[PDB]
Design a protein around this nucleic acid. Structure first.
Length: 54
RNA sequence: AUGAUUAAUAGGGACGGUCGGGGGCAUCAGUAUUCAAUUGUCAGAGGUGAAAUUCUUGGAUUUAUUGAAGACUAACUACUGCG
């Protein structure tokens, strides 16, 4: 009764300059609300990507 | 002729370069195991020849991040080694 998919943004993942393809992909985060931010729910994530893609 | 038999493909001991998973463990680890904290998601997850006992909005199972305890040291591993 909530449909939680149409309340999220999309953020573009960026790789360091040591690699050449610096666009990895996109991810979803919830909205920022009262004493609940989107950044602190985002600052811990680890992305696994093949080095052949970078 | 002044006086000691060889130097055992017997044994012991010295020496030389090695060899080995041989003999307490100090930690250095380990894509894993029930557990703990946080995160996303929505209905089942186990388990079996079929099932049931069990756990499931207190969100199970799955997913991510970070931890803490826990034979051996998987694969390498063999008609191979050491005692």
């Amino acid at each position: 009764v909530v449909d939680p998919f149409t309340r999220k943004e999309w953020f573009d993942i960026k790789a360091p300059s040591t690699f050449e393809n610096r666009n990895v992909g996109k991810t979803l985060v919830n909205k920022s609300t009262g004493l609940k931010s989107a950044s602190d729910a985002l600052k811990g994530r680890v992305v696994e990507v093949c080095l052949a893609d970078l």
